[PDB]
Structures are given as C-alpha cells and as structure tokens.
Amino acid sequence: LESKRYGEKLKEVFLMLDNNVVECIKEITESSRNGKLVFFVGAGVSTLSDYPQWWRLVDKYHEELYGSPKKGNYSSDEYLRIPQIFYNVKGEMAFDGILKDFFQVDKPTNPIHDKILAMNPAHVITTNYDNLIDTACWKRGKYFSVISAEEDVANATSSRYLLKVAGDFRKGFKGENVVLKEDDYLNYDQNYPLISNLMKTIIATHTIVFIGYGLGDYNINMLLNWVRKLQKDSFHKPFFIRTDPSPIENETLIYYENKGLRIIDAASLIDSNEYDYLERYSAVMDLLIESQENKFITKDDEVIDYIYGKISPLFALQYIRKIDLKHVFEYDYHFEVNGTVVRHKNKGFGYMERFFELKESCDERSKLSKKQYERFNALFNFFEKNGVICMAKDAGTLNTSIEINSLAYHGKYDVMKKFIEEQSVSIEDDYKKAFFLACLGRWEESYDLYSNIILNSIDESNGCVYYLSQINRYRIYQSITQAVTQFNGYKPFTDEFLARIEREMTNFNIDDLFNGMPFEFQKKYKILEFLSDNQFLYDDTVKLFELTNKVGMSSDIVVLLRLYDNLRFLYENCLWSVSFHEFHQYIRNSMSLLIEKAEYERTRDIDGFFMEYYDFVNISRHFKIDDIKNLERSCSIDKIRFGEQEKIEEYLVGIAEEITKQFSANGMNVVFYTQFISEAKAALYFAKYVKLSEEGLGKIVKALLFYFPERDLDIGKRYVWLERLTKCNELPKSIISIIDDFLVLQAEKHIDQNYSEVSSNGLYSRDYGALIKHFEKNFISKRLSEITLCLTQDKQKQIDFLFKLLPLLSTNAKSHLLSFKSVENINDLMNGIRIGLIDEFTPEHEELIIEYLETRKVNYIVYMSTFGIWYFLEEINNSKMEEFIGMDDQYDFFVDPENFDYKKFIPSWLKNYNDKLLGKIAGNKHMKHHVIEVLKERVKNSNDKRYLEILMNYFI
Amino acid sequence: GEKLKEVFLMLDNNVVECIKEITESSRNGKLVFFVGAGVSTLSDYPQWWRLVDKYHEELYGSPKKGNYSSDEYLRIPQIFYNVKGEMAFDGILKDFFQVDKPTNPIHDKILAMNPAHVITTNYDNLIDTACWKRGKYFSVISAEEDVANATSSRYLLKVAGDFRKGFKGENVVLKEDDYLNYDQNYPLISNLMKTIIATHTIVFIGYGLGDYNINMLLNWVRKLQKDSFHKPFFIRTDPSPIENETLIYYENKGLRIIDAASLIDSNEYDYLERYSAVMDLLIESQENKFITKDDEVIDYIYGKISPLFALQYIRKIDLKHVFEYDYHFEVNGTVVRHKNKGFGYMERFFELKESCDERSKLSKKQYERFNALFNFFEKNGVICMAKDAGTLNTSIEINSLAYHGKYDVMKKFIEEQSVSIEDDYKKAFFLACLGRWEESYDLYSNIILNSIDESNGCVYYLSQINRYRIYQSITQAVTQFNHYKPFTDEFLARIEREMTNFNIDDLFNGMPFEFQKKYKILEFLSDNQFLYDDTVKLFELTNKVRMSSDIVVLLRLYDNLRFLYENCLWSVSFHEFHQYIRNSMSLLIEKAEYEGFFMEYYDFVNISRHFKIDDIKNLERSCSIDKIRFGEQEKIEEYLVGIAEEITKQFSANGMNVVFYTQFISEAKAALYFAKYVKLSEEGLGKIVKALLFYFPERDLDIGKRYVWLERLTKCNELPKSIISIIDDFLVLQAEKHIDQNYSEVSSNGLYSRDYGALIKHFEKNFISKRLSEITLCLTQDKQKQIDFLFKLLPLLSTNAKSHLLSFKSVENINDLMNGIRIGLIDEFTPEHEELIIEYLETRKVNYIVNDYMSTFGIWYFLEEINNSKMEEFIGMDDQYDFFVDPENFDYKKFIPSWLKNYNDKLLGKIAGNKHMKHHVIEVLKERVKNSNDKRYLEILMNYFI
C-alpha cells in the first residue's frame, strides 16, 4: 500500500536525477557488488536511534562547571574545550560519571543501521562510540571484527573490520576509551597510531561513503586534510551522503567536491521537513538499495547491459549448468533443467522477461543501440546454446535432448590423439589438449601442459583457463598420487617426475585458489568456486532421495537432466573432476536409482525408462560389472529397452576397435589401460540389450575373443560376454566363424602341452562348441578336423581338449579321435570326458557299465547319480536294471520310483540336478506331487532362491 | 631431511616457539614475508654498493677506499643527481639494473610458505617472476597509483619502488632526497606497509641488523603502544653469530631475531646455506610437528577438541574432518589411521588411556586436559585404536526430551527460568519441537543478541542457523497453510524484514578466522553437505547388501540423530534428514529379511517420526516386519502411552497448536499404526485405544482408518475386556451422534462402524451390549437413521433389542441385504434376495448403457449361494464379475493381478477348484511373484494352487 507509493516515489526521484548522482549511485552499487564498499557512518546515524548527542554532555559539563547552561550555543572548540575544562578543573572521575549516566542507556537500532548492512559493506568504519552498529551487525548475521583500540588491530580475527576510530565503551564507560575532548583530539595520532593507519588503509583500498555527517565536522576536515597531502589520482574520491535540512549551496558543493568528496545531497534529492532526518537518510540509502535490487532498470539497453554484465564473463566457458545460471543472477530466477525460467527472488525489473520479449519480437529488438544489439545477439546465442529457451509462462513444446559435443565423452580416442599431435592455436586450444591427454592416459604430459597453460595465462584477463588449469593440474596430481598408491607402493610413472610434482605441489591450497583470484574472477566467476571444493555434488546426491521415495517435470526427468547438465559441464569445459570417485559415485547412484524407481513404477501393474546413447555410455563408463550385475539381479532391463542403437553400435565398435589397438598393437599406457578396460568390459557386458549389425557384432566379438586381455577376461568371462551378445543377434555365420576360429586357436595353443585354461566360473571351450551347436547343429569345424586327422597318439592334451569338442568335427575326424577310446572305463564317460559320446547306450557301453555296477553291488552289500539320471531318462534300458536294488538313495529314487520313500530324498539334489532332468521329473505320477511337496517345504523353511526357480519354472 | 629434525632437536626454546608461530600464521593465512636485498643478492642482482661506486667513478675520481658509510651510500648518488643531472643517473640505473638474473631458490621457499602478502624493499622483479613461475597471483603495488587499483587482496608491495614504469630514478627510492621525502611522496605505500605489519606476522628475510629500512621500522614501532602490535620475526643470516648484547638490544626493540649462524655451521660466504637452513626449517615445520613428548599429545589433541566441548555430541564422521583426515574415526569406536604419516598421536593418547604409569609422568595441567579429552572420547563413543581391542559395544543412547517425545517435560523446561544461554538454546529447540515457532524465533533472536561475549561462538552460529531453519519452517508452513494461519502478519513482516538478504552460505565464511578453523565441522550444517557422506554410504550400501554393513548403516544413523537432537539443531525436522532416516531404516529392515535385526526402542521412534503410513505399508507389503520383533517393549509402550496422552491433551483438553499438530499428527498416526508389532500391557492398550477411538480427530483418521489402526492393535495384544468396553463406548457415542438424521459415517476405505461390532464379536461371540440394547428400545419409526445403524450392529444387541429392531427393519434394499449377509440371519436365499440382486443389477444396467458391489455378487454366484441363471444376462463391466460368473468368456489378460489379496480362504479354495481359472491363476500369481516383491501372492500360490 504505502510501501508501493514509496517505491513509486523513489522511482520518479531516480528518473528525475542528474547524471552526477546516478553515476555516484552506479559506482556505489558496483563497489557493493565487488565487495569493496566501506561505510563511514557517523554521529548523525546514531542520533536517529535517539542515542544521546554531545551537546547534551557539554551542556552538563557547563552546568556543573559554571552553574548555568550556555548563553546561546557552543562552537566547535567549545564542544572540545568545555569537557577539557571540566576534566582539568573538576577531575577524571566526575567526567567518567557523567559519561556513564549519559551513555549507559540502551537504544534500539534505527532502520538505516539495517539499510547500511543491506549493501554488504566490506568494512564499517564508525566515529560512533556506541554498540548500535555492533548490535545491527550481530543481529544481521555478519561478524564484523570490532576494533576499538590498538590492542584490537593485531587481534582482529576476521577481515571484516568494524573500526571505531573515536573509541568505544566495551571496556567501561570511561573517558580513556573514547576521543571526546581536547588533549584527546590533539593527541590522536600519538595515542591512536594503529587504527589511524588502518582507517587510512581501508579508505585508500576501498570505496568510502560518509553517511551521518555535516560538511563542517572535525572528522571530515581532518580526512580532507589528509587527502590533500596525497597525490592526484592516487586514491578514489570518497562518497559523501549529505542529509542536512537545507539544500547544499553550489559554492560549498564546488569547494567540497574539489577537496575530494562526491556529495550525494538528500535535501536536493527528496522533499522533506527540516526535522525529518530519517526521511532523508532513508531516501539516498533507499536509492542505493533499490538500485542494487534492479528496481530502476527501465530501458531495454539497461536490461541487455545487466544480463551482458552478468553473462558475458561466462563466454569463455563452453557450457554453464542451470544451477550455475541460477547462481549467476543471485537466485533471482530459477533456470530449470528443461530450459524454462521462473522468477524467484527478483523484486525489481523483469530483465529476463524483457530479454525474451526482445527475443520473440524482432522489431523491438531493432529498437536498441547497435552495441546493445550485438550484446543481445551474444546473449541470445549463449542462452540458446546452453538450453535456456524462454520463460515458463511462454513455454510451449520443448524437447529435452542432450548434446555433449566433447571428443572425450564419445570415446573418439584416435581423433583425440590426432587433435593432440597438432599445433595449438591458442591457450584454450591447449586446455582441450591437456584435458584430452589426461583422458587417454598421458598424465605426465597432461600435468606438464597444464603447467604451461598456467604459466602462459598468469598475465591474462578472464582467467578461467588459468583457474581451471590450476584445478585440473591439482586433480591430475591427485590422480597420479592415487595411481602410485594403489598400482604401486607395472610401473606407470618414473621417480624424477614424482619428486617434481611433490616439489611443485607441496602446499597448493585448493581452498585458497579462488581467494587468490584478482577480484574480477571473484564476482564474474563465483559460479566456479564450487570446483575447488573437494565435494561439489552434494546438492545433487541428496536430490536422488526424491527418486527412492515410494509413494511437466517429475523426479525422474529432473535428475536425468541434472545428470546431463553435470556431465555436459565437466566434459565440455574439459574438467578432470569428471574422472574422480565423487562423480563416478554420483553417476552410479543416479542411474541405479533411476532404473530402480522406473522398475518400482513398472511393477505397479498390481493396480519404462528407455535409455539412449548418452545413457549407455554412462553405464559403460561409470558403472562396474558388479553394479550392472546388481541391476541385473533386480530391475528388469529387458523392458527398459534401448534407443539410438546406431550410435550405441558405433560406440561399441570404437570400444572394440581400440581393444584391437591396445593388444594387437603396442599399447601399454597402463593408467589409460585400467580405465579403458573397465569401460570395455562394462560396455561389452551391457551390449546384450542392444541390437548390432552383422559387421558390428563381427568386430566386437572378434575383439572380445581374440584381442581382449586374458587377465581381465578369462575364457569363462569371454564365453559369458559372447552368450550375452548372441542372445540379441541371431549369431550370423560370419561370427560363428569367429567363435570357431577361437576354438581352433585354443586347440593350437593346446599343441604346447604345458597349457591349461584358467576359468573363474568353470565355463570352458566345450561350451563355446556347445553354443556353436545350439545355434547351428549342422556345423563341422574344418580346421579342427584337420587338427584331428594330423594328430599323433601321444599328444594327450590335444587329445582330451579336442575330445571335448567332438560334435564340431567330421565323422572321419570322430573316428580318428576314437582310435583312442577306452573300454576300461569303470564309469569314465562323464567324469571328465562328458561331451555326448552317449548317443546310444549300446551293450559295448551298457553291459560294461553293468559289470561295473555289479562291482558296485560288491562294494555296497559288503558315479551313481548319473546312473539314476540316465535310467530315469530311459538312457539305460535293459532287463539287468532291476537286479542290484538296495544301493545309494538316489538309485532307489530314480530306478524304482513308484515305491520310493521321498522323505529320504535329500532336498539339495534339485539344486545340483540337470535342467532337462528337472523337466523330466515334472511329468510323472508319484515324483510329481512328491517333488511338489519337498520343493514347497523348501520354499517355506529355507533361505535360498534355487528352489523357487524350479517349482515355478517346471511343474506348475 | 633428517638433519632438519636433528636441527629441530638442537633448537633452543626461543627459536622453537618462533617457528611454531611462523608456521601457525602461515596456516592461518597471516604470514607476510618482508623480503630484502640479501635474498635478491643470492640471484647476483647488482647491489647498490656497485652503483654507488659507479656514481663515484663517473663523478668523484674513481674509487673510495673504505666501502662508504650509509650517509655515503645515499649521498654520492644524490650528489650525482644534483650535479651530473638526472638523465645520467637514469642511464647508470639502466646500465646496471636492466638484467635477467635467475631467481634464487629462496624466492621459491618464501612462496612455498603461502605468504598472504610480500612486502619487498627491492626494486627488482625477481619476486614477481617467482610468483609468475610458481602460479601465485600477487597484485604488485610499485607506486601510489596502484594502491587503489589493486587487482587482488594479496599484495606484492614494493615499498622502495620498482622499475616496471621504466629504469628511471623517479620510480624508486635510492638517493637521500628519495629517503627524506619518502613519506611525502609515498603516503599510501607507507600506510599499507604499516597496516600489513600491524595486522600480520612479519618474517623479515634478507636484511641486516643495521639496514636503514629496519631502523625506521623499529623507530615507528617505538611510537606504538606497549603490547598493541605483534613482534616481527627477523631472520638473520649474517656470517658471524649474533652477540647476545645485540640480541638483547633488538629484541626489546621489537624484532624476534631467528639467527642462522647460531643455527648451522657454514662458511663466511655461504649465505644460501643459511637462508635455506632457516627456510627449510620453517617449511618442514609446517607439517604437524611439535609432538614428540606425551605432554604435547595432550595439547595438540586438546588443541582440536577443546572447542568441541560446548557441543553436546559430535559425529565420528565429523571427527575425521577434525584431525585433517589423519585418522578415520569409525562408527563402532575404532580409529583407523588414514593420513597420519607423522607421529601417531591417537595411538599414544589411547596408550595413555588407563596405564597410570604414563599418566603420572604427565604434567598436572596436561593431566586435567587428558581427563577432559578422555571424558570427551568416552561421551562420543570413541573407544581406542583399530588394531587394539575389538569388543566394540554398540547401543548409542540419545538423551534428549525432544527425541523421546517427552512433550510435558519440555514444557516444564520452557516454563522454568534459565540460568545459561545454553539452557535458552535448549529451550528454543524445545519450543520448536513443541510447535511454538514464534517464541522459538524470538528466543533464538534473544540468544543471538545475548551471545555477545561467548568467545566460542558456537552458541551464536548454531542459534543463527537454527533461526534460519525455523524461519524457513514458518515460511513453508504459511505457504502450505495458504486449518488456520497461526502467525500474525506482523510476525511475518518481522521475519521477512529482519531475515531477508540473509544467506546461510555466508554465515560461516565471514566468521572469525578461528571459528573457520576450529568448529570447521559446523560448516556443513548450512548446506546439504551434512548428510553427504552418510547419504553416499547409504546409497552404496543399498546397492551392495541387496563392523558388518547393517551395523555400519545403523551406527551412522544413530550418530546423525545424536548430533542433531543432542546439540538441539532444528535441521532434524527438514525433508532431507527425514528421507535419510526413512531410507536407512527401510534398507535395514529389508536387509533383515535376506538374513537378524532385533529392532529396539530407538528404532520404533525413528520409524514413527520420520516414516509415513504409505512407506510403512510399502515395507509391510515388500518385506515382513511381523517375525521381526521389537526388543524393548516397555520403553516402546511408554512412548505409545505418551503419544496417547498427548493426543488426549490436544483434543479432549481443548487447547491445540496447529503448527505442533501438523508435525505430531504424522507421528502419532504412524506409531499407533506401527504399534501392531509390540506387545502392550492392558493399561497401555486401554490408553492408546481409548485415545485412538475417541480423541484422534476425524479429519485425519476417519472411522475406517481408525478401525484399520484398531485391528492392527489387536494382533499381538489380543482384545481384552477393557478394550471391548472402550469399543462399546465408541459405538454408543456413534449411536448418540447418529440420532441426528444429518450424520453419516464418512469412511475412506469402506470399513464402517459395523466392522467394529464384527471385531468385538470375533474375539468374544457373546458380548451383549447393554447400553446399545437400551438405545434400541427407543424406536419411534421416524428416526430411521439410527435403526439402520443398530441394524448394522445387530449381533451386538440383545434378544429384546433384536426383537424390537427386526420388527421394524427388514430386507428391502440391496445394501441392507449385504448388511444382513455380514451380520447374519440371512443364510437361506429365498427368491426375494436374488431378485433384489437382479434389481440392483438393473439399476446398474441403466448406467451400463450410458464403491461397487457387483464384485461380491459375482463372488456369491461363484460361491453357489445364489443360483439365478438370469444373472448372466446382465453381464457388466467389472471383470471380477465376468471372471466369477463366466470363467470361459473372461479373458485373463485384463485380470488385474490384484483382487487375490482380498479373497477369503473358502473362495480362494473355490478358485483352486476349476481348471481354466486355476491354470490362468497360477500364471497370474507366478508373474506377480517374479515381478513384484509382495509375499501374499506367493502365499496364495502354495496355499491353494501349488
């Protein structure tokens, strides 16, 4: 109501203002924004809080000295001599008693004591000897180190000095702690030598505003005398706020403006009464505050100039996140991840709304100055590149697609190398090369290049490429230090280099990296202060909590877009913090929680989340095989599907091609190797869910099982990867040839007798042959057959290994191998030599195993589980079956099943049985309900998962 | 390397304290290196004696035997300037000083100490080049016109001038005239130099004890007060050792002379050796040090924990940050060394624990410090070093009346007068937990105002943060409140005028530089870095498990709760912490099923305050909390009794606080719903049931949800006589409220007050209600709504009440027909009930051409009670009914795989006995248990179908 009227009054006052006062306000606001504003409030400020004046105390001194008050008024000297006459004649204790009974009072702070601190002054120099400004600072939440005496100058903890040049009363209401009289003003430079120098240092290095003074004060003229001693242009002219009832005469204005003061009169700027001081004090102060709050921005040239002044620093950076953009305009607007802007704290003009109004209409944009037109063009290009498209009120359709156009993210190691081995056009060109060297391993060269960038950019404006290079040098140093903490302590780095980085990065304080910047990289780029901190994704990891709660931007889309923004900020701006454990943990948690939340919503069918190329790259880079396995044993990835299968295929091919460039060619790069092999393992493991072309699967499989390292992927892991790949494709014959080539290579490596495949899952070359047969039963491995035909009798390792691959051979090959059969096998057909030599259990086998089972009767009444499985599968069929009853429990279970006691049937057999056998036990009469009941009793009173995957899969 | 610590051993007491102060100032960013001409000489920069001799050579013959005096050092250049001119002076300056000397290592040892400023008396560029090479930005200030235009806060202040504006005699202070009117030509440079000298630690290097600059500086320091200034740290590296009389003379003049000739035996020309000796001493002293004896283990640890004595409890995660990541204080009480490459002070300290032989050697003041440190480590739960011990007793105990729900003792503390600011700090948080946010904000502001002396500053910072969070709570409430608005608009004006432009991220950065060093762990309370480590561990452990992991989650959660509730921080009542508690406890309880989690009193209060009813239902569906016991069931019972008494005091005793209500009604509802799992005494049962059925407001718990809560209560506690009487009183109250024709049970799930009669009967089957029967015998035949109520409670009435009621109420509507099915005395289905079902079906057909019971009519048709084959002619849209009356036509794809949860034993057995529906239902249940984690479907599968 009345506040709005006061705002309109301030607006029209600013509109009807000369260029001198608006320039004074502009400089005061720019000092308040650079953190260089220092207020020099005086006695007039505290009087508005009704604090006792000094004419009252000099009146008391005159009344207690001469018996009566003054016959008129006191001059400047009589304000300093009558207290001195009282001190010299009466004494000290009476002086302090009067000071106590006049100054012990407690008065509340006036609103101007809060308007003063609302401008965020660097220091507050005060001539007041009262704790009113101390009270305002303490209530406001700003710790201003109070410096009352010279014992406080050295003991001033913080760098925010609340300097009381006249003294204070915190050490008692005595005259020795304040400057009040003669012999205390004459003796000020020899009783107060350290706050005088501190006041004269704050004044010379900052911007000074004199608030509560008249242009006749001792504490104004003594400073005007000191600046007269100074040189010309050696110091900034201090600002002076004048709030006297009468307007300033032009002669006095000229006199005090040539003396050093930039007077901002209030009686010549507002209309008020003689005794209305709080109106004048709260007029110019309100003018500065509302100017800082952007309440006086009217022209579209000032709209463009404000946004340009806040954004055009960030032109050096290749991407700025929406969170960073919010931090730019002091939380006035919320730039959302989808690109819509909403006003949050802007209490002044809508400069962003006006900017987008200029964007939509070309005719109003033409109604602008040419320089401001080009500034608008620059801002428009910036905002359309970063994704800020318009306000939410005017938001219509908007596609949220990400584009991280950095060669480091997309793989592209060969293009990265080609870019590295070139001539650097500029320093920002060398910054990309340094980050790229860090990406593909060469951390020594990356550290050296970052040092060179720092050296060349020490003396250079807009020092992002200096600051960011220092940060990435400290992070590549941390990466080297951690590399030789866990890989050592092969040999990645030399010892001369390590000593050099420890002799260079000895006391590099990353905390003080931002505070060591030249005060322009403190305001223009305060959005980059978060990079020097050790942890910077804490505002994002706790946003993942909105994902895990169970009951146009939901929680799913906003965290994925914020993940993309963090990814596009580190990869496009080439920041090495993208490889640390914090960012890897962030990506892991965010993608895992996104997939888990999608699975939770999908499983609410009791009453999604397609992932594109940029998601596949993240689950290949920042995930591990265990983490993807943890997602596999939970979320149904078979439904979360995949998109952009052409770019995922080229990603996997570039990963597969680099695999056959690091093992086929001479690639050690052991620090690059550990990261890249994790990426390759995760990518080729996650490639089960993407459809690949014939040549795509051809190159990837050929990499997987010819050029992948043996140590990282054994033959079992290679088979698991291969089977996961062959699920989705149909395994074209060009790739079955590749698997056959692997088998012939392993057979030829088995020519050397002292060789044995080491597998971690027990899954071997026989199962590669099984995969070949189970997609193509009509297949004869020709080269394997040539090995069979030209194989000697005494090459035992080849004999057994290539026996394990019998179906893949010809009939002549089979007979050449079976030239060394066994007929002494007591049961040696499936102990280690199980391939499928069974086919028909002829009496050459059947009767001989029956003789062995007679020997087993001899061993029992005075190898079995396979007899039971074999007979129940009708593989043994003879009248000699029901001879040797009374043997092991499983014999009674399988051989005489319609009389068996299934209570003795051990529960764990079904966990180690054969799946086709469980399929056969499903269809029968008695074993049907008995395995039903034993498996049900396992489901209730036991704690595993094997029994549940049999009851529900087979039977019913 | 080791010779440096040998020198450390040989250091005198006066030297070893000087290095400690210098290193401390370097770590506090208060070091300023006053470099001189003895350091640039190590680079072989042309000394002024060569140029004085050159001025002598071009003007005064050639040499001057005697090496000149200081007056002769400053007069021959002045005589040359006066007579031979200025251009010749500048020409000789250009001939000598335009050189490219390489920077000596001391230039890099100075900047390796991280000096705040560098006040050089040299006119050279070697320190500028050293800063440029190292990577330090120093705003070089050579002239007066650069003081105001200083780019950075760090100053490379060249007091004597510099040749960066040309090799001229005007830009430097070299002659006698330049040294006489120096303060007339350089006022701002002098003021800056004196301000830096007064407000920093000056470490003069490269000077002699003569050195006119040093003499003028000491003369100026003489004019200062007695102990106003700090004493500068002169580094003397002259060849001869300093005479003791000279050191006495200069030490009383201001300088703290660190000698080098009395520090290392070197030649008469090994200046680099002495400079490097002192500089390397300082640099190697930066890394911890000063901790060799047992009386220094109790001052370095007391130098990092004695601030933390005002905090009532701190986290072990915070304890890791306290000791600069030297040790990783684990949550079970072990202290794993992480980056303590120097002396093992934790090991030594825990060795001085017990072991009275070691403690007796310790000094008496160090003994009190050790007792304080031991009490601190005992209170916070730190036991000892990692490899030592291992028993590691659990059970963190949060002692706070806010956590335990003591809403009456908190009021007592609030009402009583307080004797300390920390008592008001507890009182303000107690007010905040009690809803009274206005008095909370006012008392917090009073604490900030009255924390003036308070040299710790942790009762001002925590109160400022808590006032910010209570202001956020008030603003978010009045935003959400749009009940009533409890805060007067004057209060909103006060909180939005005082607490505007107050950013919480500027509070810590702006504190005393001591408070930013000690109480550093308090800086996470502003932003969300407070939970960052614990949230990361929670996410990683949620991925992993699905000193053992389950214990790691629990102990970290209890650490976070004991940091917030015991320190009385309002950050506990915010969203992020609530989600942290909820996710951690959900992870623990889910981990229990994979195994076991005992669950204690401290768990029950956590799953009541921070969980919601929806999350409770999620945990009950997914996992099983039934077999998971709840340990201490007497402290849980007192908690539930306190909650019942609080809702009683809130509703039946008129006075209620809406801001307190909004927080407490989300916890009372959760605890009384989670009270199923705890055994409750008859007294506690009666209290919380008579507070649930009568005093819980109907806007937050209607009849149906009240009944859900009540059936949950009567599972582990049965339904005794006193609770039966309570439910009877509830039914009586409902009857006298339903005497009015405009009253109706508004239920959100469909379990009306008839179900309460069913619950009473289910545990009794013979509870004749005397008062309800008395209510029945007032039949006026116009008070229908009442007759219908007691019709729904017909089994609860007596034989006379049944006789009077059934003489008026009969079966003439579908609703009272299904009510008759529920209450009984229908059983036999005479044709009128079947055709009544058909009439309801007709009224449904009227909608069909264009709250459902067609499901239970399909149920009845499957249950072979009704047999009218015309019901198939009225096949509708509810596919339960299509399933039940036409199994073959019903496609089971549209069968929502719910509806099996709410089926009885007999009906599920009936679906078991029909081929098509049976096999389709195995398919449905199978896919349900593979995709969904609910166990009810699995129970159905192997109770009726497997």
Residue numbers in the entry:
A (entry chain B): 6 to 494, 504 to 565, 577 to 632, 644 to 898, 912 to 1005
B (entry chain A): 12 to 493, 503 to 566, 578 to 626, 644 to 898, 910 to 1005
Task: Please quote the paper that reports this structure.
DSR2, a Sir2 domain-containing protein, protects bacteria from phage infection by hydrolyzing NAD+. The enzymatic activity of DSR2 is triggered by the SPR phage tail tube protein (TTP), while suppressed by the SPbeta phage-encoded DSAD1 protein, enabling phages to evade the host defense. The Sir2 domains of two side-by-side DSR2 dimers contact each other to assemble into a head-to-head rod-shaped homo-tetramer of DSR2.
The gel filtration profile shows that the DSR2 tends to form large oligomers. The resolution of central part of DSR2 structure is better than 3 Å, and that of the very C-terminal region is relatively poor due to the dynamic property which was indicated by the local resolution maps and 3D variability analysis. Local refinement focused on the C-terminus of DSR2 improved the resolution, which allowed us to construct the atomic model and precisely assign the sidechain orientations, assisted by AlphaFold2 predicted model. Interestingly, the two side-by-side DSR2 molecules form an asymmetric dimer, with the one cavity at DSR2 C-terminus closed while the other partially opened. Comparing these two cavities, we observed the structures of the C-terminal domains of two DSR2 protomers are distinct. The C-terminal domain with opened cavity rotates upward and thus moves away from the cavity center compared to the closed one. Additionally, a long helix in R1 of the HEAT repeat domain of one DSR2 protomer with a partially opened cavity directly contacts the C-terminal domain from the other protomer, which facilitates the closure of its C-terminal cavity. The interface 1 consists of the contacts between the last two α-helices from the C-terminal domains of two adjacent DSR2 molecules. This interface is primarily maintained through hydrophobic interactions, wherein the hydrophobic side chains of I981, V988, L997, L1000, M1001, and L1005 from two DSR2 protomers form extensive hydrophobic interactions with one another.
